[PDB]
């Protein structure tokens, strides 16, 4: 499950919102108001996803395994840029892997929903055509299946 | 286990209502959702209509798709832009035959022949696929693509996001109950939810809603319960909410009894698609046998399917299953012979191949690598064990749990079309309510693709269906407001009894949401084919869970919450508890083995293709608490063969 | 799951030691300790001789009879004072063929003269036993007496605190490890523990050393998960504290593979003992059919253990595996027809069955009585489910794991001699180290009265050894001064890196006591014939526990506590880790399947007689760090034929 | 697992000892030095053996079925006293049973541990003999068992 680091963190400082607790799929990082530092608030309900450590001020959040099955010593960090992501995988017996893959081909918000599509008739509105089709699906015409004689 | 900080109690009366108004309400922001935005903000110019998008949690990476995906498992390729072409006949056919013959092929070849569409704009949108140096997809499998998918569902929320428009999605609202039109009782006209980051009621009028929740996991106890019972192999996020409100509202469900039990790295659960298609990996027992062939043999008493290539996923799940009951544990994925076989002495390819493999984990399913990290388990050195996971229940991988839903005029046989109202494409028998991704039962393997690819069909189909029927549903003023006391009765229920005991978690009055989980899943495990009975079962067994999910269902109106997150929580468990019903209901029903794998009626041990080559449909009528259920035949709808 | 209230946090070198010198020094004070104390305080007068009994909780009611007892499991009665006269030969003959031939029968011949006169010492204090109109105690079953004994406890605490006197007796202090003498690397000269009320560390300074801690439970993951994790069959109480201890100090352990699983009321685990041979129950499958006539067949290969009368218990566990692998589940204990046979349509007759039968569990395990009120079971109208229970290991009961001890003079051959340094009844291979109750092995079925007359014999034992070797132990301060700074080194540990983390049991450096407990229960259930595989294993498996246990045993070096609580639970789990591996190790070293029924070795599926009829012993040498195995074959002591 | 009852408890500030945090095996029972009212600090650990109920203020502590298979409304209430115990038990239905069982047949702290017993001998010490042996078996001769030839 995730954990923050007290030294590292600083309840977001004056960004407009709180990185963890916006991204969490399963609603598990929050705010103590008193130490202004964040915390998973059900770690057994931590699916491991590191989304709020990806989206937190680098370091200020990380993850130790599962206890069940976990010995201590393991740890995976991303460094996620914007084009590419960066991993370190430290094993328990000090074996130290770099990896990094590439995420996106394209700037972030960069996306044109209906880019080149022509606008909706009410008479496409009854046909089988998704939007972009069949151009987008490649093929020289919607494509055709045969049915069971 | 929770234990909240602070306590954050609001009674119903005090909390302000935000009713919301739109055409076409999406329930859930995950692949199908985000598919059904996309595609809805299209069409919806041709009348202006308003397109509304609610989640619990935030698009940007709710759902299964969190840490992203590391292949599109669906992608059929007409043209050839992959190292392998397909046919949509051949498709079809691979699906029928893996569902061990029922599946409701209008549906497949309908999702099938738009699927590469989407994934053409996926890559559009900048999503990275694997490319040969020739410029082609890298194909996993026969119907498989590898993808650098860490940012998968970023991606595909920034298209949606662009396509509707911020201002028309709810983020961290969780809707509970759908509503119908007091006019018409078996039609929607909306639903209810509540903010979890706030004291607000929301009601949401609409004139078409469409399911896409995700399915629903943690309903049986996981072999890992402490803290990683967190560890479900399916989206943990997804709790069978589309189940519950639709269910409740009279639609009707279909192979509600086809689950699905993942064979996985053991633990950590990391995938075994890439390693098994793409790196050839070979899975053997404790004794080093290839079980795939000394297994082999058993499957000929399930001609035809036992024959089909591949073998259906169910009959190698039951080859696992002998070699468990044999003792002959533990089960080896071989990653060192595979990584060795692979590289041909060629150390620059080992450390290209090597670095695939660590993606393939670190791109979906980061624990596994952390779990080789704690564990020293290098996958070029040692092997790794392997093991079947606890049931989930969801209709867009593997299983074909969800709704019964309506297939396109083009595609739907007579055979199909007789419970459904009004003929649009993936609605449900509640006119006006869709289903998709997970929540759309009958047509699997789906996955990101093609459960997004889904969405996109429902929505279309919900345009045309307002455009069409022109709908004005009213929603019940007096029904409202119960659910409203009904939404926050777990904190007024806590406030009330919490005086009784010095613990908060130990009441005569009330349960707290971990605490009736903790309940259902060792009812489902120990009774409905859990891992406790290596997924066996009988009428008896199913009789008993019925008569202590009964038990369970009653203790819920003394459910309490002591924060947001927990009435969350307590909600999640609601909607559980009744798609754990249903999905009992339906296992006791259908009296067969079909999917040995994923689940055995010892008292039925056998596939029954003379009475049970049916899909089992059934509704549930909360008026009158009765549970119907019903047989339709499968119809051979694509033309293939064995 | 542990969430404690405020920090209680102490360094070692701020906690003041409390030094205790005595010569008979008693670990545990339940049922086995009080018989020690007992006959310790008789004996001490020839000498002068102090005794001091140390308990972790309260002697009044800790232990396996905390809540009571419904019955006596060893009353020979060899006068005619119960509905029921046997011989000593009858009996062990009877242990004998329950353990499927292997038991020390001198070791069992000898604590069976004794129990009597122990019964009736109980009776003169105030026990009440169940009589019939004629006066003689009721029996249960051949070697069984009923009893009101709700306060058994109390009444045999009262009886040992009256001989061997309050101010010697020390309770609220846990015993964490053995001293050994200075100058003799096989001698005990004493042990070290601490308050869990107040910050203090003990150094007892001792001549002799009984260990009287009762067996080990939660080694195995058990059926329920959540709260119910508490509700083992066994005493949660008991965590293998005696078999850490003296298996580090060099005492050799015994049939350490021998688990027991007992065959319970579902989930309460309430007993069946009178149900069966009380009240004639009968337990059948899901379909009616009685196990123990349908898989007679099956016991015909055990020779002659198979044709025995009773069937031993192991094999009874294996007819009702049978039925767990096959789903015929559930099996249900028929108390309706039970009663309504035992009645004969005699209302007043069914009253008084009726609150005998509800006394058999009000007086033991209250629980089975709580699920029936939850569940509204009415034992006269329905049946209740049966099942058997995780693993547990003891040595008192129906199993007889534990510590190879001497046995008396007139009785022990010298088959059984060769490794004890000094021949005195019950004493290990540990000089002056004396082992009772659960905790001395290859000699079960003593049960309450048989546990406080094993106490009782090594009590005399340990007075004659002192007045005859005049034993003179020296502690090394050097080593108790190490051994101070590991018992509260978790408490410095959570205090150097807690703040790593913002939550407390979230962090990389350290694991807690439930999270080191949860994932020793993980892997002994998965690899070591746990529930999760209906109790079957293999070398490969128990090869791989011993590296998961490693990486445990290695973890237990970073554990954390924030109170006194926690660091009693700290140790008793360090007790649990040692005593599941050399319960992993023995079971590796057996190459047979003895006990179907209790564990299953599916590479070696058959009873070896052969070469296997021999008490496995071993011993762990922390020096070198090295465990030694060796074969003792067993040897018929007493007159008995089958 | 057990809970207290409020407003019963009263940390048995006026006896010696706290009945509870005495009592219990397993050491849950502990005392809120705050409220002065005991509760269970880790349930999951207890046993449901009634030890602390029955020693304490007859209604300050109850038991209420562990969650994973106890549907709520059940309950065993004990009245304990110095020659029976008296039970009450209630069903989720409504039912109520109500039993007495005999606990001891002897005023408590009664006990004389070696009463009738002769004082012990260097020459005893070396017999298989326990205090009061024969005897207390109930036979004139110490009991024999016949050896394998
Ligand atoms: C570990 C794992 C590995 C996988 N690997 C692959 C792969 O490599 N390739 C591939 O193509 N596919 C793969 N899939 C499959 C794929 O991710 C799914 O098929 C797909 O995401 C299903 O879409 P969905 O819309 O039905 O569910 P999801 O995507 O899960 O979305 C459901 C949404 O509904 C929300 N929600 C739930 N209940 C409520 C409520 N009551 N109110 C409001 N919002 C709610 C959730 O928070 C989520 O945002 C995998 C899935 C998992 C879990
Ligand atoms: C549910 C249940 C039902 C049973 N039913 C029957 C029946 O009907 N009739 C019958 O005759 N027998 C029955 N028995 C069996 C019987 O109770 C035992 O055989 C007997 O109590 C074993 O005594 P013991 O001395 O070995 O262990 P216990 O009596 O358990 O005593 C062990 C003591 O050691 C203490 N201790 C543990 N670790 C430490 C440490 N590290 N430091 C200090 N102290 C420590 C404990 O707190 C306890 O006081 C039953 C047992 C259970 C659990
Ligand atoms: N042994 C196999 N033989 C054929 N197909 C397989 C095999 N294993 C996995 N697959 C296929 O590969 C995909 C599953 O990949 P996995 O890595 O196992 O996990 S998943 O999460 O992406 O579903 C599906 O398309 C499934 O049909
Ligand atoms: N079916 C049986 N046949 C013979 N003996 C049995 C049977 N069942 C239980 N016993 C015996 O009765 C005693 C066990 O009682 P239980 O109620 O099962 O629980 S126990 O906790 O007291 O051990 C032991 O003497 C055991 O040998
Ligand atoms: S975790 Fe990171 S994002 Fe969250 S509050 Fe702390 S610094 Fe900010
Ligand atoms: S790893 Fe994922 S599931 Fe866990 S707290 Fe972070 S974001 Fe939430
Ligand atoms: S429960 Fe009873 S014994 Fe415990 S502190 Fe409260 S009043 Fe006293
Ligand atoms: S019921 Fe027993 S184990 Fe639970 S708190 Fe009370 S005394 Fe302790």
Do not use: D, L, M, T
């Given at each position: 499950p995730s954990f923050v680091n007290p030294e590292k963190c600083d309840g977001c400082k004056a960004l407009e919102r709180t990185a963890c607790e916006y991204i969490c799929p399963n609603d598990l990082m929050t705010l103590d108001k008193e130490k202004m530092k964040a915390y998973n608030r059900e770690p057994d309900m931590c699916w491991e996803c590191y989304s709020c450590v990806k989206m937190?001020?680098?370091?200020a959040i990380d993850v130790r395994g599962y206890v069940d099955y976990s010995p201590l010593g393991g740890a995976c960090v991303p460094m996620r840029g914007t084009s590419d992501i960066m991993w370190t995988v430290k094993y328990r017996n000090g074996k130290v892997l770099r990896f990094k893959f590439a995420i996106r081909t394209t700037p972030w918000?960069?996306?044109?929903?209906?880019?080149?599509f022509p606008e909706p008739t009410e008479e496409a509105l009854k046909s089988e055509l998704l939007a972009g089709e069949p151009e987008i699906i490649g093929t020289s015409e919607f494509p055709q299946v045969k049915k069971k004689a | 286990v929770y234990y909240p900080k602070k306590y954050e109690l609001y009674k119903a009366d005090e909390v302000p209502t935000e009713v919301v108004e739109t055409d076409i309400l999406i329930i859930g922001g995950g692949f199908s959702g985000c598919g059904a935005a996309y595609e809805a903000a299209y069409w919806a110019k041709l009348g202006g209509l308003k397109v509304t998008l609610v989640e619990?949690?935030?698009?940007?990476?709710?759902?299964?798709?969190a840490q992203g995906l590391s292949a599109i498992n669906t992608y059929i390729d007409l043209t050839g832009r992959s190292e392998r072409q397909n046919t949509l006949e051949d498709y079809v056919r691979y699906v029928t035959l893996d569902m061990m013959g029922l599946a409701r092929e209008d549906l497949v070849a309908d999702y099938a022949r738009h699927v590469d569409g989407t994934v053409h704009l996926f890559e559009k949108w900048g999503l990275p696929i694997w490319k040969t140096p020739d410029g082609k997809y890298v194909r996993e499998g026969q119907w498989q693509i590898m993808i650098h998918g860490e940012s998968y569902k970023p991606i595909i929320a920034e298209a949606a996001k662009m396509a509707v428009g911020e201002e028309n999605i709810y983020e961290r609202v969780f809707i509970f109950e759908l509503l119908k039109d007091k006019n018409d009782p078996n039609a929607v006209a909306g639903a209810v939810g509540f903010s979890v980051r706030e004291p607000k009621f929301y009601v949401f009028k609409a004139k078409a809603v469409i399911l896409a929740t995700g399915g629903a996991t943690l309903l049986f106890r996981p072999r890992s319960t402490g803290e990683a019972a967190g560890r479900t192999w399916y989206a943990i996020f997804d709790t069978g909410s589309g189940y519950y409100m639709g269910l409740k509202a009279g639609a009707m469900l279909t192979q509600f009894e086809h689950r699905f039990i993942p064979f996985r790295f053991k633990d950590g659960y990391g995938p075994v698609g890439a390693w098994f298609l793409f790196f050839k990996c070979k899975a053997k027992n404790a004794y080093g046998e290839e079980y795939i062939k000394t297994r082999a043999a058993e499957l000929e008493k399930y001609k035809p399917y036992g024959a089909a290539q591949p073998i259906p996923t169910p009959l190698r799940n039951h080859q696992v299953m002998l070699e468990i009951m044999d003792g002959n544990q533990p089960i080896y994925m071989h990653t060192e012979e595979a990584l060795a076989e692979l590289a041909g002495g060629d150390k620059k390819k080992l450390k290209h191949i090597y670095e695939e493999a660590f993606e393939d984990f670190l791109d979906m399913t980061v624990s596994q690598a952390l779990l080789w990290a704690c564990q020293n388990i290098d996958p070029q050195e040692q092997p790794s064990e392997a093991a079947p996971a606890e049931p989930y229940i969801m209709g867009s991988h593997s299983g074909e749990a969800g709704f019964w839903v309506c297939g396109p005029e083009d595609l739907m046989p007579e055979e199909y079309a007789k419970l459904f109202p009004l003929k649009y494409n993936r609605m449900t028998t509640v006119k006006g309510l869709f289903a998709i991704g997970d929540?759309?039962?009958?047509?699997?393997?789906?996955?990101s693709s093609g459960s997004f690819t889904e969405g996109r069909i429902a929505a279309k189909a919900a345009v045309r269906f307002i455009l069409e029927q022109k709908p004005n549903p009213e929603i019940d003023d007096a029904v409202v407001e119960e659910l409203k006391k009904k939404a926050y009765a777990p904190m007024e229920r806590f406030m009330q009894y919490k005086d009784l005991s010095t613990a908060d978690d130990v009441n005569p009055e009330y349960i707290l949401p971990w605490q009736g989980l903790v309940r259902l899943q060792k009812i489902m495990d120990e009774?409905?084919?859990?891992?406790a009975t290596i997924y066996k079962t009988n009428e008896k067994m199913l009789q008993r869970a019925l008569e202590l999910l009964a038990f369970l269902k009653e203790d819920l109106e003394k459910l309490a919450a002591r924060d947001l997150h927990e009435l969350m929580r307590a909600w999640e468990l609601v909607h559980r508890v009744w798609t754990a019903e249903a999905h009992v209901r339906h296992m006791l029903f259908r009296k067969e083995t079909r999917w040995p794998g994923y689940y055995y009626r010892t008292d039925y041990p056998e596939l029954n293709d003379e009475e049970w080559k049916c899909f089992v449909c059934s509704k549930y009528d909360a008026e009158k608490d009765e549970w119907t259920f019903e047989k339709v035949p499968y119809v051979q709808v694509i033309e293939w063969s064995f």
């Open positions: 937190c001020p680098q370091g918000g960069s996306i044109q929903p209906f880019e080149g | 619990k949690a935030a698009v940007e990476r709710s759902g299964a798709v929540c759309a039962g009958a047509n699997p393997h789906k996955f009774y409905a084919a859990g891992i």
